[PDB]
Amino acid sequence: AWKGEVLANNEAGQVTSIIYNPGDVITIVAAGWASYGPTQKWGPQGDREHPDQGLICHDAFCGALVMKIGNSGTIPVNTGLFRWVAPNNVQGAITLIYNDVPGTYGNNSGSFSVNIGKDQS
Amino acid sequence: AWKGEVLANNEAGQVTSIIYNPGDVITIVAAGWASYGPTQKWGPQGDREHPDQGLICHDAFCGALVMKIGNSGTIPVNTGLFRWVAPNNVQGAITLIYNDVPGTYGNNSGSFSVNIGKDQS
């Protein structure tokens, strides 16, 4: 299992120790407060009121937690995933990323604390 | 394992099928959007800007997810718990509740989708 912080201003994302292999079942729980710029902060589901101005993940709100697995596109994580299995052909190291517009991470603040484990399968 | 919705306007709380027994390790993931009255909505961590005006749980924000185990006091859940063990002497059915001021649940709306499972131990 892995536990760590994902900083909102980390554009490259936080690489975890989890290698997702075909058939793996995983659970993620994410908590905390972060901002993409405004004084307010939002949880891991991001800001449901903010328009998408070119986010790295179009299937989650600005300020949400998302992930990539190996060479995958971004996949929404939000508050987490419960005994979740990846789509076919998705595999590799899990990187966690704050959802923002590329090039605009400099003014971000806060972080999410995240646990990832592999479940029985 | 249990999956269900917890309505924000449900003052008594949502009883789950989970009975927490001594030694149990559990994982909870909570998602979704709800309100304690305003037109806006918040995630399972609630509204970090709203003062505590007499919440059923003083250790979580208004609009956060909390729980009771048997006849325990409220315990914060927020976005969830990862491989969590209860304090000594705490056991019984898990009830999930929206954190609001007693008697003020009538104007609440929305719900959280919640998964609870027992982990290997």
Ligand SMILES: *C(=O)c1ccc(O[C@@H]2O[C@H](CO)[C@H](O)[C@H](O)[C@H]2O)cc1
């Ligand atoms: C309203 O016009 C408005 C409020 C805040 C805001 O913040 C920017 O959002 C961008 C992503 O959409 C990016 O994160 C910038 O760094 C933020 O300052 C934009 C617009």
Ligand SMILES: *C(=O)c1ccc(O[C@@H]2O[C@H](CO)[C@H](O)[C@H](O)[C@H]2O)cc1
């Ligand atoms: C101040 O701007 C303000 C005060 C209260 C409020 O909503 C009420 O919050 C209560 C809990 O603190 C309770 O949930 C009531 O039902 C709400 O109407 C909004 C804004």
Ligand SMILES: [Ca+2]
């Ligand atoms: Ca930004």
Ligand SMILES: [Ca+2]
């Ligand atoms: Ca209310």
